[PDB]
């Protein structure tokens, strides 16, 4: 039931070629359900609403920093850029940003 990885982060939305932040306080986390499937999730830290809940298998996606912004923007990108989910880090310090990125990739692509 415990989250395999978690970190505060907000969402962003891409329209045309412009990516704009959602202002909400949020939490990205990875969790294994009782049926052993791996879920990548985002929840509103204020309301508690789980707004994104994706079931991920190895080689579906990669989590990578977005140099275009540094605003600490990361994107979850599905195979052939079919889907992109953008996030901005909300941890007060940057010291774990890269390790959070490594752990996301590890648990999604080698759980």
């Amino acid at each position: 039931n415990k989250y395999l990885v978690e970190f505060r982060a907000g969402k962003m939305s891409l329209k045309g070629t412009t990516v704009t932040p959602d202002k909400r306080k949020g939490l990205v986390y990875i969790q294994q359900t009782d049926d052993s499937l791996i879920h990548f999730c985002w929840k509103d830290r204020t309301s508690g609403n789980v707004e994104d809940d994706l079931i991920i298998f190895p080689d579906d996606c990669e989590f990578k920093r977005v140099p275009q912004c540094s605003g600490r923007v990361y994107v979850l990108k599905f195979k052939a850029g079919s889907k992109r989910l953008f996030f901005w880090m909300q941890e007060p310090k940057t010291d774990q940003d890269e390790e959070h990125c490594r752990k996301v990739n590890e648990y999604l692509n080698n759980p």
């Binding site: 505060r8 412009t18 990516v19 275009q68 605003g71 909300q90």
Partner: peptide, 12 residues
């Protein structure tokens, strides 16, 4: 304290 949102940006 918690960071403010980044400014919008272009993604090509």
């Amino acid at each position: 304290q918690e960071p403010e949102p980044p400014e919008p940006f272009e993604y090509i």
